[PDB]
Amino acid sequence: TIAPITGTIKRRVIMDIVLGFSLGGVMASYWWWGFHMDKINKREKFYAELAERKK
Amino acid sequence: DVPTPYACYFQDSATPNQEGILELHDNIMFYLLVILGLVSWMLYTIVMTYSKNPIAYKYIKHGQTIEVIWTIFPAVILLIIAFPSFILLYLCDEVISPAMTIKAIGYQWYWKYEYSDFINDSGETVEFESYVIPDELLEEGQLRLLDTDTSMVVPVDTHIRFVVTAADVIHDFAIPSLGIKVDATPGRLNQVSALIQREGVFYGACSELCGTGHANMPIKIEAVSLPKFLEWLNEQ
Amino acid sequence: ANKVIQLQKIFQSSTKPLWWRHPRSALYLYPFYAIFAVAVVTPLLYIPNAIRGIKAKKA
Amino acid sequence: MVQRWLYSTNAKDIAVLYFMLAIFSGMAGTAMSLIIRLELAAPGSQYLHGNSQLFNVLVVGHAVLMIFFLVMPALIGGFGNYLLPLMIGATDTAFPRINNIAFWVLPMGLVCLVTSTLVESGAGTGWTVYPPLSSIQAHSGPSVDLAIFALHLTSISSLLGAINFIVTTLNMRTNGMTMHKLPLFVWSIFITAFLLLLSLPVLSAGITMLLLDRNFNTSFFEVSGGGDPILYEHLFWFFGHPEVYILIIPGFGIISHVVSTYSKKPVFGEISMVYAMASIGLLGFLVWSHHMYIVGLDADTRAYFTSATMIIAIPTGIKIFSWLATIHGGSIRLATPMLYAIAFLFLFTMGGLTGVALANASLDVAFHDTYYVVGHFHYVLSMGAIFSLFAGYYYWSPQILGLNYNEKLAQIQFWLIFIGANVIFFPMHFLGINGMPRRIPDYPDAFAGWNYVASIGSFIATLSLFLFIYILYDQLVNGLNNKVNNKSVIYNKAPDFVESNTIFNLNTVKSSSIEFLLTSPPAVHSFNTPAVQS
Amino acid sequence: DEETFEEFTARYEKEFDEAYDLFEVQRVLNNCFSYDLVPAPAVIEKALRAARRVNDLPTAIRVFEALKYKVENEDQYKAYLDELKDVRQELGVPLKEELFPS
Amino acid sequence: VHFKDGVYENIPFKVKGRKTPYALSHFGFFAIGFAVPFVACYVQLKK
Amino acid sequence: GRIGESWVITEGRRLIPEIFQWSAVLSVCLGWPGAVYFFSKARKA
Amino acid sequence: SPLHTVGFDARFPQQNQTKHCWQSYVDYHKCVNMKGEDFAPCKVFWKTYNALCPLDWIEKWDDQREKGIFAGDINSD
Amino acid sequence: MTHLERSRHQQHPFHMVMPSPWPIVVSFALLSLALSTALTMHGYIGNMNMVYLALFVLLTSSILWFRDIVAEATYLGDHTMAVRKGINLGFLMFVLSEVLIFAGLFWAYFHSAMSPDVTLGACWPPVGIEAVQPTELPLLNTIILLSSGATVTYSHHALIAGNRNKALSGLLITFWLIVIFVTCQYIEYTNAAFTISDGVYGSVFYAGTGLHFLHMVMLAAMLGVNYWRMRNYHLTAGHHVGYETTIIYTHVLDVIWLFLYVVFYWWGV
Ligand code: HEA
Numbered sequence A: 001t002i003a004p005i006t007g008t009i010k011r012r013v014i015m016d017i018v019l020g021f022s023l024g025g026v027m028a029s030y031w032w033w034g035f036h037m038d039k040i041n042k043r044e045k046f047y048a049e050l051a052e053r054k055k
Numbered sequence B: 001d002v003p004t005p006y007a008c009y010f011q012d013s014a015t016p017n018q019e020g021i022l023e024l025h026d027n028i029m030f031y032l033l034v035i036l037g038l039v040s041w042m043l044y045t046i047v048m049t050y051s052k053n054p055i056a057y058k059y060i061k062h063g064q065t066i067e068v069i070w071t072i073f074p075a076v077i078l079l080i081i082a083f084p085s086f087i088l089l090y091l092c093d094e095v096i097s098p099a100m101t102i103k104a105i106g107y108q109w110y111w112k113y114e115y116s117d118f119i120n121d122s123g124e125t126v127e128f129e130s131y132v133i134p135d136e137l138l139e140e141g142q143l144r145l146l147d148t149d150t151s152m153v154v155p156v157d158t159h160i161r162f163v164v165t166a167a168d169v170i171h172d173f174a175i176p177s178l179g180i181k182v183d184a185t186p187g188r189l190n191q192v193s194a195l196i197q198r199e200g201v202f203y204g205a206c207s208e209l210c211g212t213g214h215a216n217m218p219i220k221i222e223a224v225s226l227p228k229f230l231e232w233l234n235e236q
Numbered sequence C: 001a002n003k004v005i006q007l008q009k010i011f012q013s014s015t016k017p018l019w020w021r022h023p024r025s026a027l028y029l030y031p032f033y034a035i036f037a038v039a040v041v042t043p044l045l046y047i048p049n050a051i052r053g054i055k056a057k058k059a
Numbered sequence D: 001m002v003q004r005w006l007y008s009t010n011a012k013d014i015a016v017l018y019f020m021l022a023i024f025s026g027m028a029g030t031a032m033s034l035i036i037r038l039e040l041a042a043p044g045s046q047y048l049h050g051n052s053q054l055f056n057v058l059v060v061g062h063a064v065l066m067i068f069f070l071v072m073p074a075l076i077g078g079f080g081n082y083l084l085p086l087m088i089g090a091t092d093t094a095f096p097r098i099n100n101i102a103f104w105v106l107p108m109g110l111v112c113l114v115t116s117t118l119v120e121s122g123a124g125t126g127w128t129v130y131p132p133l134s135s136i137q138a139h140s141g142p143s144v145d146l147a148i149f150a151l152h153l154t155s156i157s158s159l160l161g162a163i164n165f166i167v168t169t170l171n172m173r174t175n176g177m178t179m180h181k182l183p184l185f186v187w188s189i190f191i192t193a194f195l196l197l198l199s200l201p202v203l204s205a206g207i208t209m210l211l212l213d214r215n216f217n218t219s220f221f222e223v224s225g226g227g228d229p230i231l232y233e234h235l236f237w238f239f240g241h242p243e244v245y246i247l248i249i250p251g252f253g254i255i256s257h258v259v260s261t262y263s264k265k266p267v268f269g270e271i272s273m274v275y276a277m278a279s280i281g282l283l284g285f286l287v288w289s290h291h292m293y294i295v296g297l298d299a300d301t302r303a304y305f306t307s308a309t310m311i312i313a314i315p316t317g318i319k320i321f322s323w324l325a326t327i328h329g330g331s332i333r334l335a336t337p338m339l340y341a342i343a344f345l346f347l348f349t350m351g352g353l354t355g356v357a358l359a360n361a362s363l364d365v366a367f368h369d370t371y372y373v374v375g376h377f378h379y380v381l382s383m384g385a386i387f388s389l390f391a392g393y394y395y396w397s398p399q400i401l402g403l404n405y406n407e408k409l410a411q412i413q414f415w416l417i418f419i420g421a422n423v424i425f426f427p428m429h430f431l432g433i434n435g436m437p438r439r440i441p442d443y444p445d446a447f448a449g450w451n452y453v454a455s456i457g458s459f460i461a462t463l464s465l466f467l468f469i470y471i472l473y474d475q476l477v478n479g480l481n482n483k484v485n486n487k488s489v490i491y492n493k494a495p496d497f498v499e500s501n502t503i504f505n506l507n508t509v510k511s512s513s514i515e516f517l518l519t520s521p522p523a524v525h526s527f528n529t530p531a532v533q534s
Numbered sequence E: 001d002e003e004t005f006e007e008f009t010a011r012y013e014k015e016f017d018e019a020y021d022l023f024e025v026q027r028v029l030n031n032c033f034s035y036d037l038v039p040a041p042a043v044i045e046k047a048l049r050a051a052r053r054v055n056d057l058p059t060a061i062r063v064f065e066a067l068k069y070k071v072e073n074e075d076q077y078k079a080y081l082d083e084l085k086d087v088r089q090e091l092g093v094p095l096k097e098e099l100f101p102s
Numbered sequence F: 001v002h003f004k005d006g007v008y009e010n011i012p013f014k015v016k017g018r019k020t021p022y023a024l025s026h027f028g029f030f031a032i033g034f035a036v037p038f039v040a041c042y043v044q045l046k047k
Numbered sequence G: 001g002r003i004g005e006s007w008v009i010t011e012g013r014r015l016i017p018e019i020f021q022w023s024a025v026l027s028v029c030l031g032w033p034g035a036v037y038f039f040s041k042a043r044k045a
Numbered sequence H: 001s002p003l004h005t006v007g008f009d010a011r012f013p014q015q016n017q018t019k020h021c022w023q024s025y026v027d028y029h030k031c032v033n034m035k036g037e038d039f040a041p042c043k044v045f046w047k048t049y050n051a052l053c054p055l056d057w058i059e060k061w062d063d064q065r066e067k068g069i070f071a072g073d074i075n076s077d
Numbered sequence I: 001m002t003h004l005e006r007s008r009h010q011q012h013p014f015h016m017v018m019p020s021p022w023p024i025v026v027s028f029a030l031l032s033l034a035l036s037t038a039l040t041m042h043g044y045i046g047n048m049n050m051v052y053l054a055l056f057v058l059l060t061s062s063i064l065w066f067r068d069i070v071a072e073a074t075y076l077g078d079h080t081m082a083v084r085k086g087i088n089l090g091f092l093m094f095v096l097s098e099v100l101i102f103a104g105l106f107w108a109y110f111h112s113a114m115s116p117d118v119t120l121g122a123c124w125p126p127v128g129i130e131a132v133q134p135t136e137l138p139l140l141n142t143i144i145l146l147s148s149g150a151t152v153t154y155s156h157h158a159l160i161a162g163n164r165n166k167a168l169s170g171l172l173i174t175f176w177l178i179v180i181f182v183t184c185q186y187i188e189y190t191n192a193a194f195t196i197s198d199g200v201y202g203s204v205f206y207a208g209t210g211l212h213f214l215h216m217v218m219l220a221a222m223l224g225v226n227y228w229r230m231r232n233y234h235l236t237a238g239h240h241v242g243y244e245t246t247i248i249y250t251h252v253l254d255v256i257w258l259f260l261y262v263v264f265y266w267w268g269v
């Protein structure tokens, strides 16, 4: 007999979309972590090979 | 360089322009990935939740909050994915002293590159063709369907311009590794300043149909140092 | 004029095709297409019959 | 049959001819594209011993048949002239002679292309006809001329269809319907007709100019005299960009209709729907030169064009969110049209966002005229043309003809074709992103495995299509036996979960389109009294 | 979205008042469940009164099942318990204890 | 035009007749569909 | 009177199986190309 | 080039330099074909056409001057 | 009786058309024209008379359909306000597509305003490219065309108002002016400005002028058909489905000619 109803109009879609956005962002960050490690490793290798032969 | 087999990402970078293109690509693809994840999960949860729903909420039409939310979010998302493209275009298109200039004409199913910036013996203009070696007459140890008898050379740690044109049909100067891709108009020239910071051999084929025999379009770019470039020029 | 109303009345009385205006023109034009276009499209594939068969096989 | 069919003047009796030509052309084109993929499986002349001109000609035939002769004749005309007059309620559309002359001008294009491939000349310059490669300088013979007349006749038929659509929907629309209560598919076809009208003449003029240059010993775009093909590329892309929207928008309409009729809930802002569609249609013209960033235009021009592209992308996202709102919070019966719609909402959206990502001004340095763009458009074409047409067929066939289809067969066909299309088109993004070029029968020795998986997927897809045509046969031969038994679903909208089944006898099918409320297809000149809405 | 319960409530009872047969009962109940407004015990009692007027016990069973499962509402039970027991023992429509163990 | 009941009259087929039990028609449709790629391949090269 | 939920308990017990299933579906849909890569002689195995 | 020719470029703020070679070549051809004694007035943009401009344009213009039909719009001197 | 037939033929402005062979025959004519042209310009047989007869019969079929589209409007009638509005809107969209054709012709060379390109042109005005310019050469005819259109637009307004001897005078004036225009068009048959060998700048202008020389022929054909009909007096001052078409055509062609004369003549010179 809880009088306050009609509160389920919008919070469902809001929680759904916010959870989806959070899941997408966290999966993107997890994927990009290793790719960024690879990118920085390759950049370090490029700098090392570019500077090591000159000196 | 060589297209790595079974690859699922971009080729090895050779120039700061190409690596900047790669940076813009991954920055864009990050937000594209989050958007696609959002929409895919929304689809999945909708179909896996409301498939069993007995009675449908058929009197919901307005949704002002979500309306304003996804009306204002795409604007800033597009602005933040477009700003890096603008800044990368500004940085890369900067014509910062292209130190080398060579001809690159797309002929009928072959290329005849003419080097006029430099000379060979005394003032003469160096020019030669680039013919793809036939598959049947292949020499052992080469790359099939692409390798040429003679190719082009280029100094490293310098700036280069590829003057692109055509003779009868439009060609394409497609070198993804070197980050240059400009059409070959029949009569109209185009200037692109390619600066290379990494040594190596960069491959390439024309990304434009040339009629019938376009299956073999040899564009091989070989990077050499200044003394090696001088030796090649003296030999040529 | 003096023939519109009679013509409409006769056409309504005789609900027939060809619209009564150009029967001779229709009878003249009907065989011409068959005589001309068919006989001009037949060579298009009849002549290259000996030309056809270019295998161009290489090995 | 000649007395009523070959001499037909009825829109309903000619929509089925539209469908028959569409399905035959699709089966032939799928067979030839099957071949095209089959010589692409391994490097070398596995099946095409030399003669790359044949490979190019087959590619051109595939592209042209799917674009102009397969689906544009199918969803624009065939669905339009069978629904729009039927949904309006008018007995007959104005001047069915227009529809008949539009239809009958198709097949000679097919025969002229087949003989153009037959002759040694061939049209092997791509489905784009960029000069001078299609002129007497490179390609002699009649192949170019036959292709030009084929596109001319297809454009004429499209113009006639658009004329009929506009006149029927605007001049004698039924009294009940007004501007503020008009359904969605007809709005889609109306905007499509507007874009077609504003797009056809420029193509006609430019291609007539090319024909005259090839004949009158002159050159307006060829350098032989001082011309420049950049103008022709401008004009051709100015035609081309509207064309994809022309072929895609009625898919939007039918998908919105099916999700509305299957979710048991109304649309989400039909005013917003038509706003999005009209905005897309009007905004399609701002990117006339966005497809050729490689040319070397000014930085300001590229910035304006990419801004136009990113503006264009937004209404599509609005429409996608609207579909999500329509599906959210509603009961769903997982029937096959829902399967097609969900596959659309997934793969079309992913492909479109990839294309938006590529829509950067300087990003064509990596994807343009590579396998990435083919992975781009194969996605959206397959979702909005193949899957849209499938959804429409499985959504209207039980009533427009009275014949049902085997639901299990439909489900397995959908699964087969979906997995085949995915496994075919997905690797080509990996192909392109490396930087491999396009339009070459033989390729370097790097991505053999991706081509192989594409080929096995192509075989899967053609097996799916064979199953589909077998389903067509079974429906056409076993409809009365399928209706009586439990082999198929006979009520797409199940009763609400409060309502008794005995009372459901008088509530059979009630939705937002009249053609579902009709009986078995009556005489062609039905609707003695026009429908009126209170 | 700031919509009063009382107006539509009173509409539901007044439509139940002139329920000639089960068609208007069915349509009104479906419309009531269509909103997110979880039905009040009073409107459910009025609906059961209308169902007893039209003499179709299956309507009562269906509405009881709908009340048991209409919305999650954070899985509230005792509200459902009272809203079912008051209308079961108000007059007597014994239906729940038979479909469940079958 | 109003002399058609509207059952099978919408398709240029005919159940009546031993000439084609809906097999020769479908065989011919398969044949005409497979004709254009096969003949296109055959005229200049092998299948 | 706030009977039972406490949104968190039911919300987690419903989402976590669903999220795990969805992640597994994506893992398979991206591991089948990886499955092809492994099974194919990428490293002469 | 020994990694040092100009450094920072500020001639044209906008990115695209499609209409750049004509202005940088007209002055060069005018100063070369007027006095020929001292190139000091046009001694500051040697590289703007040798390497900073497509040499195909330069050779086409030279051949055109040989044949008397110049691509650009200049006088007969 | 009256009510039932009124309802059964009111919202049905479409006749129960016979098995009209028009679609198949016109399609056959177009296909024969296409294949014959392809075989003749570059093929195996270079005969010209047969393809000329093919073009002739295609034009005869087109004229037959075009005269029917107005004969059935009066001889058969059976038209309402809605179908008249639809036919007028169809003519408007047809002339709009023609205007789009003209705009494409203009844009074929009108986008070179401030010379954005580098080579192969990009010079407005094209200094050095000075052949016999087709500009300002037919302006002596353009001005008289403007005067004729101005003096016949209101004459055709009085036509649609009364359809009387004044309308006959206006039609005769139109016949005279179109005869003068076709005469002065054919007088510049071969040597109008020049031929296309090198430097294609006025050649595109010549082609654009040439390809539009058929719309005036179509206008003259419709005027002659209406003249014959009103000589037969089938068409009174009632369902003038052709008079409205000709007045809208003459009210749009003067506008498009004015737009053509705005630029391309005094712009760049
Ligand atoms: C409808 C549009 C459509 C469809 C269905 C297809 C189907 C296929 N396409 Fe194609 N394609 C294009 C539109 C389409 N394509 C276009 C526009 C180009 C541009 C050419 C260019 O870039 O130059 C192109 C180019 C193109 C290329 C470029 C080749 C080259 O670089 O030269 C390749 C390469 O393999 C290819 C492959 C395939 C394959 C393997 C299929 C297979 O999927 C075939 C199986 C078909 C599908 C799975 C869809 C089902 C189709 C049906 C007809 C089902 C029939 C039933 C109904 C219609 C009711 N396509």
Ligand code: HEA
Pocket (backbone or CB within 6 Å): B035, B073, B074, B075, B077, B078, D244, D245, D247, D248, D290, D291, D309, D310, D313, D314, D316, D317, D318, D320, D348, D349, D351, D352, D353, D355, D356, D358, D359, D360, D367, D368, D369, D373, D374, D376, D377, D380, D381, D384
């Ligand atoms: C069915 C046909 C079809 C469809 C629907 C599309 C849809 C789109 N296309 Fe594509 N395209 C083609 C057919 C199609 N295209 C063809 C045939 C080519 C040429 C290939 C050839 O020449 O061989 C091509 C090429 C092409 C190019 C040039 C690449 C080339 O070289 O080929 C570009 C880039 O500008 C592009 C962009 C887009 C965009 C932005 C959409 C969009 O309309 C996509 C619509 C979907 C959405 C955008 C989803 C909504 C997005 C959101 C959910 C919002 C998220 C982002 C924001 C914040 C706004 N297309």
Ligand SMILES: [Cu+2]
Pocket (backbone or CB within 6 Å): D241, D287, D290, D291
């Ligand atoms: Cu586009």
